[PDB]
Structure formats: structure tokens, C-alpha cells
């Protein structure tokens, strides 16, 4: 039993 | 003339 | 003329 | 003159 | 038995 | 049994 | 005058 | 004037 | 005149 | 087996 | 097997 | 077997 998560990932600005 | 923006906030796991 | 903008915001996962 | 925009927010998984 | 989620991607603004 | 997630990820802004 | 609001989850 | 909002989770 | 708010998490 | 994919943006 | 895809925009 | 991706910007 391999649990696996991510972590979000929010990203940028003006470009 | 006051431009402003954001940047994109994504977030979170298993929760 | 001030302009504004955001940035979009997406979340979650199993929860 | 005001302009202003909003961004999407997708969200979820599992619950 | 391999449960997968995803994660919601809400992304953008002016553009 | 091989649970995963992912997390969001929302992103941008001007562009 | 302007009032935008924002996303949440649950 | 102006108000803008953000983005929680829970 | 101008507000804007930041993201959070929980 | 099994391939899920990543949202990008421009 | 299977195989999902990813949200893009432009 | 299992394979995932991630999210990229530009």
C-alpha cells in the first residue's frame, strides 16, 4: 500500500 | 492610472 | 482608469 | 474608467 | 485496487 | 493498493 | 462603489 | 472604492 | 481606494 | 498502464 | 490501459 | 505502470 499526495502548485503574475 | 494583478494560488493534497 | 485583474485558483484533491 | 476581470477557479477531486 | 485522484486547475485572467 | 492525489494548481494573471 | 469576491472549497 | 477578494480551501 | 486580498489554506 | 496529464496555460 | 488528459488554455 | 504529470506556465 504506496500512498502518494502532491502539493499544489500556484504560479505567475503579470506574464 | 494604478495597474495591479494577481498571481494564481493553488493549493492542497489528500485534505 | 485603474485597472485590476486576478489570477485563477485552483484546488483540492481526495478531499 | 474601472476595468476589472476576475480568474477561474476550478476546484475538487474525490470529494 | 489503484484509487487515482486530480487536482482542479482553475488558471488565467486578462489573457 | 496504490491510492494517489494530486494537488491543484491554479495559475496566471495579466497574461 | 466595486466589491469582487473570491473562491473557496470545501 | 475597490475590493477584492481571495481564494481559501478547507 | 484599493484592497486585495491573499489565499489561504487550511 | 495508466497516464494522467498536467494543465498548462499560455 | 488508460490514459486521461490535461486542461490547457490560450 | 503509473505515470503522472505536472502543471506548467508560460
Known amino acids: 500500500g ?3 499526495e ?3 502548485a500556484g504560479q ?3 506574464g
Open 12 to 14: 505567475g503574475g503579470y
Open 2 to 4: 504506496d500512498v502518494i
Open 6 to 8: 502532491v502539493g499544489g
